[PDB]
């Protein structure tokens, strides 16, 4: 894939080069998957699932492990390795394992509330194996 900047990315990008390439090749193979098998919105579920794992790799390298530099962190967010809004929602203590950024939108639901993805299982009902249609999982 083209980096779309051509501006000589700094050190640490070669350390995260094959890891981000394997996640990018997984999303491109998921984007080339046909519409068979998925019912109506299940085909967009591996699109957010590969995007959720791509944002978790950069955030763990910056906040958890703190091994990547801040100059390589800003170059990764600008080139499109991880969304800045997804890292902003994970900075708050109220949401650290959110499914998708579409599930946190208050205006998305018809009843004007959150989804089942942003709800714990202990506070939910007993018999419920439901999954979020907009987000993708719990």
């Amino acid at each position: 894939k083209v980096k779309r900047s051509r501006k000589a990315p700094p050190d640490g990008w070669e350390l995260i080069e094959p890891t981000l390439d394997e996640l990018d090749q997984k999303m491109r193979e998921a984007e080339t998957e046909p519409h068979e098998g998925k019912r109506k919105v299940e085909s967009l579920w591996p699109i957010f699932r590969i995007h959720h794992q791509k944002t978790r790799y950069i955030f763990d390298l910056f906040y958890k492990r703190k091994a990547i530099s801040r100059e390589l962190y800003e170059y990764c967010i600008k080139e499109g390795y991880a969304d800045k809004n997804l890292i902003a929602k994970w900075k708050k203590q109220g949401y650290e394992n959110l499914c998708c950024l579409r599930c946190i939108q208050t205006r998305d639901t018809n009843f004007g509330t959150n989804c089942i993805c942003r709800v714990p299982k202990s506070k939910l009902e007993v018999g419920r194996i439901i999954e979020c249609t907009h987000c993708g999982c719990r």
Partner: protein, 49 residues
């Protein structure tokens, strides 16, 4: 108790039905009476005047 949550429809769409041919109201009225003045004959020369 039932919450009235208005569903936000798509603001780019053709209308869901044709022109409504249903009756909206009732063709009877409240026919209020006149009670203006007692109508009577004018005169015997009213046919000649």
């Amino acid at each position: 108790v039932i919450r009235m949550v208005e569903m936000q429809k798509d603001p780019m769409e053709p209308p869901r039905f044709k022109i409504n041919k249903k009756i909206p109201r009732g063709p009877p009225s409240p026919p209020a009476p006149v009670m203006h003045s007692p109508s009577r004959k004018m005169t015997v020369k009213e046919q000649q005047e």
